[PDB]
């Protein structure tokens, strides 16, 4: 279930793997992405 | 017993009024000389331009729609035409017969080939071209791949051809293009991706021959229905390397060092060590990303690196920068009169001409060449001048003792 | 020989001393690229002042004449030039038979009847970071109810950018809402022939004079704005003419003007306009027409005696470079129409996209330095004297 | 020996600072300030269309019909005509030369009369709250035809000034380009245009307008804002620099003046005539001369020839940093109002009405001047003294 | 009758009080305004 | 037959006199023009 790096987290903003965030892209769909400070 | 104090009084004033100027030397100060002149000859810059639309609708084949259909938001995750489609019933039929994969065997597919073939053709877009009264052809444009897809570069100057020059200011001695953006060839937009665009027109970038085009980040825009004038002014900046400055080529992917080159470099390595592939527009020699790789690795990893990551790439300041001060302006086209004429000349409707025809004039003004250069403020030569003038007194006193 | 040398020294030094006295100033230049860049404040305003659907009967009663929607006798002007559909809606609103005027406040009118950032903002990003209407600080100006991105006043830290390009800058998609534009039946300071928005890029600590120093952005185009931060530093007298207030925290030519405009408009009308500082009673719609507007227009366009603003010792200028592309494309039109439940024609007349960012070279400084300071004065001369002395000694 | 030894060492360094002198070095001082008073520049603007369709008479169509591509080489209406059947009739009755006797024809007169009238185009004008009239615009002829110059500052009128920044203290024009008066385009010539709108140039009073080469554009249906910044550059004459001072056609030396000069002499010694917009006192080229000599010779000189004209660098240059921007006009609301105010259709207002705001910003005056780096005084400072010491 | 400072002088360009002028505004109607050199 | 200086060389790009070229103009028809290096 856990969504990996660079993957689509649409309708699942909280299903990202450890160290990831559901990032809304400026030109496309949401993507699980390495969390940054 | 007074001579010893005339020698100590001589050696004293030597170092006393000398150490005050050597500290200013080890400061490594730098004067920035300015000079805004007009050059007799001017090396006209490279002009890279790209169409906002990536793939021609008439060039997308059944096989292409099969491999990159999902990427273009023309198909869902199940090789079907999305129900959220928002196109007329005339393109729907043509697109459905193309999305018919019943009894279909997928032929091999390559992105670089797709961009090259399905991309926009300079030979169809270029309705007119001049450079100093000299008429130019599509063969004057060097094909360059970038995020927008298949772009082009006038006066690219790499490859065995000499870089063009100009010796006079004004439109008469500059580039003048008349393009046909071909909105009728624009891919239907049914979703929001990195390969779809809400806008129509072109994206242009004026850069030095030896500076790769980062047209998606540093380019300017030109719209259809207008003749755009761009008065330019070449500005050359020179910086000093350290101990004087912070500036400084690896020659890994590119010949000359550029902030852009540095970024293109980082983007490539990053995208490679994250997806095990490179995007069509990237240097190096890695396997080109597949349509699937684009959606699930390539695009995301790149977007993040550019818009969100500020740790990975650390580009130093170049010691040589060529900047072009741009000044835009426009007028409507066509006039209510010349419309019916342009319509007949290109076998298009009057409405079409207004939505697709474009004219771009890139040139220089009177004052065309400005230089901002960092010079070594205090060199060894001048240093030994004043400090050396105090030696003649320490030598004359060293004899009397 | 010693005598000659002495003369020489003399020749050298008196002049040197004088040079030191003229208070000369060298202007050092430096155009570099900063690793970090403090992104500027972006104030933007809609050309239309009041939403047609928010103007109530009471509002039309108090400020109807000001908006040229009513004559001097609380009636709908015969010179009206609107369709028969807005005429009916506007007549039922201008019906004051058996109507009791409730209290009315301009500042409230602007705030409520103004354009809502929450309706105009269809999209917003700043370095891949999605932003909301809550990132825009409401600021009142001559155009009415405007907004400021990265205002940086109020307890929030001012945003920064470390890379060049659109990807690391502001990107807005607005809906100017022409369908909400007030009918123009006359020419006033509150009416506009144009449609679109007015924008100004300025330092956080510089009040926006958006009506005078702003640039324009039109609907139906995506506008790109390549910027270059330029910081200028001047020297105070004896070296220069600059200097380092009451209404504002930092000194600005704009701040100085806003100041003068306020005092002037106050001592002429006994009130201030909604967008002005200080603590004076806000001008009424009537006061606007007969005192406020006239007095202000005159002060700005005609008077050159009242306000005398000195030159700031610190100026932040942003070199702007505009460009645009059409929107929507013939294809993406029917998509945007469905996404926002608007007609295709509407999207073309109302939708707007603005990209404000920096280029590679982003930070230039033009600073006035003290050409000849005490140090070098006592040094060069001093050094020369020493040299002279040594020479003498040798001669001896 | 040790005294005559440092003597031969300070005799090679004595002639060292002088080497830097015969170098004629030059420091370039920069200064970007805000002037209390600012001499507002000249604003020359021209309509892209050359001749009004309603002003072209039968005689005019006869003499310059071929030049405007409205007639073929045989005084007939080209079969390649691409106009509606309403202008075709009006144009055919005008091209009817049966029993017609050609009256004399003059280009300068044609441009002046058939050109666009500032009195019809100018719907509004202000300069610092001061309302201005067509009488504030000085008629100037250029390649585009009959143009105009605000604040020309010639004829003895004093040149206007501005002391504050912003639109409120600058020029604001509202034009009507009159597309309904645009000549039908049936062919491609130097007197035909695919574009609609105007061409503008902001220049110093004493710098002739080369508006076809160095101008910017303004389109109809938009209010254009132009934030300007005056930049004055000063160069040094040789031995220090490559520039020169004042120049015979023009009062002050300008790269443009130099080119206008060359263009004139060249076009004269090639066609034995000058174009309407050119100085000197040569016979004005006829419509026939334009097509077969004037235009070709000029186009070639400008776009192809780089040997004939050799313009030196001016010692004094005034440059205006321009920054453009625009907003749509009219708004969906103010359309029906502007339509009634000018008795035009709503669609017309959108295709023809135009608003231009030219002004300065806060920082308005920048100077880049070349100063003599090492003058005589400095030279004196070192060499003599050294010599004395030597002695 | 005499029109005071900052007032509408429409159709009455000569009815301004002492030291005033009928000034046509760039965006609105005429206004009696303090005369300036 | 030989086309002289500054003349129309339409459909006759090779009928220019000695020292001339058929030059296509940016805004108009072709013209026989002095050949340049
Ligand atoms: C600056 O770079 C250019 C290449 O674009 C080169 O021609 C020139 O020699 C360089 N200047 C210096 C001082 O290195
Ligand atoms: C002109 O366009 C039409 C329809 O677009 C096309 O069928 C026809 O082939 C074109 N004519 C020519 C001569 O190319
Ligand atoms: C210039 O002003 C800025 C505030 O915008 C301030 O941060 C900076 O310290 C000032 N520089 C000097 C030299 O005062
Ligand atoms: C779409 O627009 C129509 C008419 O403008 C409106 O009545 C309707 O409520 C809207 N639909 C939705 C789902 O908001
Ligand atoms: C530069 O030229 C202007 C005329 O435009 C003149 O007023 C000024 O005196 C000149 N400056 C110098 C240093 O000659
Ligand atoms: C208004 O325009 C019409 C048609 O263009 C014209 O016939 C009429 O004379 C105009 N009316 C006025 C009052 O000028
Ligand atoms: Cl990057
Ligand atoms: K990129
Ligand atoms: K500069």
PDB file of N, CA and C in Angstrom, chain D residues 139-183:
ATOM      1  N   UNK D 139       4.407  68.144 -37.067  1.00  0.00           N
ATOM      2  CA  UNK D 139       4.412  67.199 -38.182  1.00  0.00           C
ATOM      3  C   UNK D 139       5.827  66.875 -38.654  1.00  0.00           C
ATOM      4  N   UNK D 140       6.147  65.588 -38.695  1.00  0.00           N
ATOM      5  CA  UNK D 140       7.452  65.135 -39.155  1.00  0.00           C
ATOM      6  C   UNK D 140       7.292  63.984 -40.140  1.00  0.00           C
ATOM      7  N   UNK D 141       7.939  64.103 -41.295  1.00  0.00           N
ATOM      8  CA  UNK D 141       7.844  63.075 -42.322  1.00  0.00           C
ATOM      9  C   UNK D 141       8.904  61.993 -42.149  1.00  0.00           C
ATOM     10  N   UNK D 142       8.473  60.741 -42.259  1.00  0.00           N
ATOM     11  CA  UNK D 142       9.375  59.602 -42.163  1.00  0.00           C
ATOM     12  C   UNK D 142       8.897  58.460 -43.056  1.00  0.00           C
ATOM     13  N   UNK D 143       9.685  57.392 -43.119  1.00  0.00           N
ATOM     14  CA  UNK D 143       9.406  56.276 -44.019  1.00  0.00           C
ATOM     15  C   UNK D 143       7.962  55.787 -43.936  1.00  0.00           C
ATOM     16  N   UNK D 144       7.366  55.881 -42.751  1.00  0.00           N
ATOM     17  CA  UNK D 144       5.985  55.447 -42.563  1.00  0.00           C
ATOM     18  C   UNK D 144       4.988  56.424 -43.184  1.00  0.00           C
ATOM     19  N   UNK D 145       5.456  57.629 -43.499  1.00  0.00           N
ATOM     20  CA  UNK D 145       4.608  58.637 -44.108  1.00  0.00           C
ATOM     21  C   UNK D 145       4.517  59.910 -43.287  1.00  0.00           C
ATOM     22  N   UNK D 146       3.292  60.333 -42.992  1.00  0.00           N
ATOM     23  CA  UNK D 146       3.071  61.537 -42.199  1.00  0.00           C
ATOM     24  C   UNK D 146       2.951  61.208 -40.712  1.00  0.00           C
ATOM     25  N   UNK D 147       4.016  61.472 -39.962  1.00  0.00           N
ATOM     26  CA  UNK D 147       4.035  61.202 -38.528  1.00  0.00           C
ATOM     27  C   UNK D 147       3.909  62.479 -37.701  1.00  0.00           C
ATOM     28  N   UNK D 148       4.068  62.347 -36.387  1.00  0.00           N
ATOM     29  CA  UNK D 148       3.924  63.479 -35.478  1.00  0.00           C
ATOM     30  C   UNK D 148       4.887  63.393 -34.300  1.00  0.00           C
ATOM     31  N   UNK D 149       5.236  64.546 -33.742  1.00  0.00           N
ATOM     32  CA  UNK D 149       6.185  64.600 -32.638  1.00  0.00           C
ATOM     33  C   UNK D 149       5.688  65.496 -31.509  1.00  0.00           C
ATOM     34  N   UNK D 150       5.376  64.891 -30.367  1.00  0.00           N
ATOM     35  CA  UNK D 150       5.027  65.660 -29.182  1.00  0.00           C
ATOM     36  C   UNK D 150       6.293  66.182 -28.516  1.00  0.00           C
ATOM     37  N   UNK D 151       6.215  67.391 -27.970  1.00  0.00           N
ATOM     38  CA  UNK D 151       7.363  68.022 -27.334  1.00  0.00           C
ATOM     39  C   UNK D 151       8.565  68.065 -28.267  1.00  0.00           C
ATOM     40  N   UNK D 152       8.309  68.344 -29.541  1.00  0.00           N
ATOM     41  CA  UNK D 152       9.380  68.414 -30.525  1.00  0.00           C
ATOM     42  C   UNK D 152      10.437  69.419 -30.083  1.00  0.00           C
ATOM     43  N   UNK D 153       9.984  70.542 -29.534  1.00  0.00           N
ATOM     44  CA  UNK D 153      10.887  71.563 -29.034  1.00  0.00           C
ATOM     45  C   UNK D 153      11.605  72.285 -30.156  1.00  0.00           C
ATOM     46  N   UNK D 154      10.933  72.396 -31.296  1.00  0.00           N
ATOM     47  CA  UNK D 154      11.459  73.143 -32.423  1.00  0.00           C
ATOM     48  C   UNK D 154      10.404  74.145 -32.861  1.00  0.00           C
ATOM     49  N   UNK D 155      10.845  75.192 -33.552  1.00  0.00           N
ATOM     50  CA  UNK D 155      10.015  76.359 -33.847  1.00  0.00           C
ATOM     51  C   UNK D 155      10.076  77.367 -32.704  1.00  0.00           C
ATOM     52  N   UNK D 156      11.004  77.161 -31.776  1.00  0.00           N
ATOM     53  CA  UNK D 156      11.239  78.132 -30.723  1.00  0.00           C
ATOM     54  C   UNK D 156      10.478  77.895 -29.435  1.00  0.00           C
ATOM     55  N   UNK D 157       9.471  77.028 -29.488  1.00  0.00           N
ATOM     56  CA  UNK D 157       8.777  76.606 -28.280  1.00  0.00           C
ATOM     57  C   UNK D 157       9.807  75.979 -27.348  1.00  0.00           C
ATOM     58  N   UNK D 158       9.645  76.185 -26.032  1.00  0.00           N
ATOM     59  CA  UNK D 158      10.569  75.606 -25.055  1.00  0.00           C
ATOM     60  C   UNK D 158      10.215  74.150 -24.804  1.00  0.00           C
ATOM     61  N   UNK D 159      11.223  73.323 -24.551  1.00  0.00           N
ATOM     62  CA  UNK D 159      10.999  71.903 -24.310  1.00  0.00           C
ATOM     63  C   UNK D 159      10.428  71.659 -22.914  1.00  0.00           C
ATOM     64  N   UNK D 160       9.340  70.895 -22.853  1.00  0.00           N
ATOM     65  CA  UNK D 160       8.650  70.610 -21.595  1.00  0.00           C
ATOM     66  C   UNK D 160       9.534  69.879 -20.594  1.00  0.00           C
ATOM     67  N   UNK D 161       9.166  69.973 -19.321  1.00  0.00           N
ATOM     68  CA  UNK D 161       9.880  69.273 -18.261  1.00  0.00           C
ATOM     69  C   UNK D 161       8.921  68.569 -17.305  1.00  0.00           C
ATOM     70  N   UNK D 162       9.472  67.682 -16.486  1.00  0.00           N
ATOM     71  CA  UNK D 162       8.698  66.994 -15.461  1.00  0.00           C
ATOM     72  C   UNK D 162       9.544  66.865 -14.203  1.00  0.00           C
ATOM     73  N   UNK D 163       8.908  66.993 -13.045  1.00  0.00           N
ATOM     74  CA  UNK D 163       9.640  67.021 -11.786  1.00  0.00           C
ATOM     75  C   UNK D 163       9.206  65.910 -10.841  1.00  0.00           C
ATOM     76  N   UNK D 164       8.290  65.068 -11.306  1.00  0.00           N
ATOM     77  CA  UNK D 164       7.798  63.958 -10.501  1.00  0.00           C
ATOM     78  C   UNK D 164       7.607  62.707 -11.350  1.00  0.00           C
ATOM     79  N   UNK D 165       7.698  61.545 -10.711  1.00  0.00           N
ATOM     80  CA  UNK D 165       7.538  60.281 -11.404  1.00  0.00           C
ATOM     81  C   UNK D 165       6.108  59.778 -11.364  1.00  0.00           C
ATOM     82  N   UNK D 166       5.767  58.906 -12.308  1.00  0.00           N
ATOM     83  CA  UNK D 166       4.439  58.324 -12.362  1.00  0.00           C
ATOM     84  C   UNK D 166       3.640  58.767 -13.571  1.00  0.00           C
ATOM     85  N   UNK D 167       2.553  58.054 -13.845  1.00  0.00           N
ATOM     86  CA  UNK D 167       1.703  58.363 -14.989  1.00  0.00           C
ATOM     87  C   UNK D 167       1.123  59.771 -14.887  1.00  0.00           C
ATOM     88  N   UNK D 168       0.803  60.186 -13.664  1.00  0.00           N
ATOM     89  CA  UNK D 168       0.203  61.486 -13.424  1.00  0.00           C
ATOM     90  C   UNK D 168       1.013  62.654 -13.955  1.00  0.00           C
ATOM     91  N   UNK D 169       2.321  62.459 -14.090  1.00  0.00           N
ATOM     92  CA  UNK D 169       3.199  63.518 -14.564  1.00  0.00           C
ATOM     93  C   UNK D 169       3.907  63.151 -15.861  1.00  0.00           C
ATOM     94  N   UNK D 170       3.168  62.524 -16.770  1.00  0.00           N
ATOM     95  CA  UNK D 170       3.712  62.129 -18.055  1.00  0.00           C
ATOM     96  C   UNK D 170       2.690  62.261 -19.163  1.00  0.00           C
ATOM     97  N   UNK D 171       3.080  61.862 -20.368  1.00  0.00           N
ATOM     98  CA  UNK D 171       2.203  61.958 -21.527  1.00  0.00           C
ATOM     99  C   UNK D 171       1.164  60.842 -21.533  1.00  0.00           C
ATOM    100  N   UNK D 172      -0.070  61.190 -21.885  1.00  0.00           N
ATOM    101  CA  UNK D 172      -1.137  60.201 -22.003  1.00  0.00           C
ATOM    102  C   UNK D 172      -2.000  60.482 -23.227  1.00  0.00           C
ATOM    103  N   UNK D 173      -1.895  59.606 -24.220  1.00  0.00           N
ATOM    104  CA  UNK D 173      -2.601  59.779 -25.481  1.00  0.00           C
ATOM    105  C   UNK D 173      -3.671  58.710 -25.668  1.00  0.00           C
ATOM    106  N   UNK D 174      -4.794  59.096 -26.263  1.00  0.00           N
ATOM    107  CA  UNK D 174      -5.792  58.127 -26.692  1.00  0.00           C
ATOM    108  C   UNK D 174      -6.064  58.299 -28.182  1.00  0.00           C
ATOM    109  N   UNK D 175      -5.559  57.367 -28.982  1.00  0.00           N
ATOM    110  CA  UNK D 175      -5.637  57.476 -30.434  1.00  0.00           C
ATOM    111  C   UNK D 175      -6.745  56.631 -31.055  1.00  0.00           C
ATOM    112  N   UNK D 176      -7.116  56.990 -32.280  1.00  0.00           N
ATOM    113  CA  UNK D 176      -8.038  56.202 -33.087  1.00  0.00           C
ATOM    114  C   UNK D 176      -7.344  55.905 -34.410  1.00  0.00           C
ATOM    115  N   UNK D 177      -6.761  54.714 -34.520  1.00  0.00           N
ATOM    116  CA  UNK D 177      -5.927  54.373 -35.672  1.00  0.00           C
ATOM    117  C   UNK D 177      -6.697  54.345 -36.994  1.00  0.00           C
ATOM    118  N   UNK D 178      -8.019  54.241 -36.910  1.00  0.00           N
ATOM    119  CA  UNK D 178      -8.873  54.305 -38.092  1.00  0.00           C
ATOM    120  C   UNK D 178      -8.579  53.196 -39.094  1.00  0.00           C
ATOM    121  N   UNK D 179      -8.850  51.953 -38.711  1.00  0.00           N
ATOM    122  CA  UNK D 179      -8.652  50.834 -39.621  1.00  0.00           C
ATOM    123  C   UNK D 179      -9.593  50.928 -40.817  1.00  0.00           C
ATOM    124  N   UNK D 180     -10.733  51.583 -40.621  1.00  0.00           N
ATOM    125  CA  UNK D 180     -11.700  51.766 -41.697  1.00  0.00           C
ATOM    126  C   UNK D 180     -11.137  52.680 -42.784  1.00  0.00           C
ATOM    127  N   UNK D 181     -10.022  53.336 -42.479  1.00  0.00           N
ATOM    128  CA  UNK D 181      -9.365  54.223 -43.431  1.00  0.00           C
ATOM    129  C   UNK D 181      -8.094  53.594 -43.987  1.00  0.00           C
ATOM    130  N   UNK D 182      -7.791  52.383 -43.531  1.00  0.00           N
ATOM    131  CA  UNK D 182      -6.614  51.661 -43.998  1.00  0.00           C
ATOM    132  C   UNK D 182      -6.750  51.266 -45.465  1.00  0.00           C
ATOM    133  N   UNK D 183      -5.685  51.483 -46.231  1.00  0.00           N
ATOM    134  CA  UNK D 183      -5.664  51.095 -47.638  1.00  0.00           C
ATOM    135  C   UNK D 183      -5.710  49.583 -47.785  1.00  0.00           C
TER     136      UNK D 183
END
